[PDB]
Design a protein around this ligand. Sequence first.
Ligand SMILES: CC(=O)N[C@H]1[C@H](OC[C@H]2O[C@@H](O[C@H]3[C@H](O)[C@@H](O)[C@H](O)O[C@@H]3CO)[C@H](O)[C@@H](O[C@@H]3O[C@H](CO)[C@@H](O)[C@H](O)[C@H]3NC(C)=O)[C@H]2O)O[C@H](CO)[C@@H](O)[C@@H]1O
Ligand SMILES: O=c1ccn([C@@H]2O[C@H](COP(=O)(O)OP(=O)(O)O)[C@@H](O)[C@H]2O)c(=O)[nH]1
Ligand SMILES: [Mn+2]
Length: 273
Amino acid sequence: SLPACPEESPLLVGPMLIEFNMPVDLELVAKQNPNVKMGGRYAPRDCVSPHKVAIIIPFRNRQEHLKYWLYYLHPVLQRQQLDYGIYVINQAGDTIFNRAKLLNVGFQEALKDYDYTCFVFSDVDLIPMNDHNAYRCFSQPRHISVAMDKFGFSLPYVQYFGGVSALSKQQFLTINGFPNNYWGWGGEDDDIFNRLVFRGMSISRPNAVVGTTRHIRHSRDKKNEPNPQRFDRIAHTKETMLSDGLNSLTYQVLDVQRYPLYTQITVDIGTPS
Ligand SMILES: CC(=O)N[C@H]1[C@H](OC[C@H]2O[C@@H](O[C@H]3[C@H](O)[C@@H](O)[C@H](O)O[C@@H]3CO)[C@H](O)[C@@H](O[C@@H]3O[C@H](CO)[C@@H](O)[C@H](O)[C@H]3NC(C)=O)[C@H]2O)O[C@H](CO)[C@@H](O)[C@@H]1O
Ligand SMILES: O=c1ccn([C@@H]2O[C@H](COP(=O)(O)OP(=O)(O)O)[C@@H](O)[C@H]2O)c(=O)[nH]1
Ligand SMILES: [Mn+2]
């Protein structure tokens, strides 16, 4: 009988220095994080966390960003005293990218590993600047990346729900997960915001200082061009969410790799139907 972890972690140091211009060596990060177990799993040795968190990263062709992510997050997530695992959902193939479908795959496959009850959905190029910005679930859906540098350290609009967010297992199931048919860039986070509002929820957020986040500057990805149907799509979420999401999801996992600091699920999610 380990006792419960304190409600807020005593380990946190607050604001942090973040930079992206040095090389990163994941063997060395592994050695700096000796307590992270194979597949990027950690829980505290001294107490039991109520936070059973799968962190889900949609991914293709961003290995350099991913090493920064893992270098910065792993120490922060342990200081937060979370029982967590990292999942990188790698889109097989070279056709148009589908962020939100990959996120659904992540939810469904992490559940096969462990009784996770919280899901964090994080883009791979967003790093929090303050470890008081909690990477776990709340009684309402949680928007985490609230004051990104690239939007002037505030929200680009008050209904913005992109970047990094957290939903409990019950919140995600309540909205039928995320939509599967936003192919290419834009709009799927707005649809997900729509979904939560249509199911009676509201967005919880840390303050702008605690929520300061850095984005790793990068040029445009090929095969994730702006989706021209995105404006039409987000205008119909209430109706389309009933039968587009978790209850219409299929995919084929091609490969699961347990690396020391993460599990990578390589997955064929198809093209538009
Ligand atoms: C529905 C949707 O697209 N939601 C996303 C939202 O989009 C807002 C806005 O983004 C603009 O691109 C920005 C981008 O968001 C920034 O991250 C980046 O730094 O710079 C880009 C350049 O400013 C789009 O240009 C804009 O699209 C335009 O929207 C108007 C109507 O509002 C249309 O009439 C016009 O046709 C359309 N133009 C083009 C060229 O496509 C619009 O998408 O941005 C957030 C934050 O990035 C995303 O998370 C949301 O998914
Ligand atoms: O080719 C791609 C496209 C996007 N992504 C992932 O999806 C997120 C969202 O895309 P992004 O905001 O970076 O697009 P952009 O800034 O170019 O408009 C990224 O942070 C990555 O986690 C990826 O891994 N490879
Ligand atoms: Mn980006």
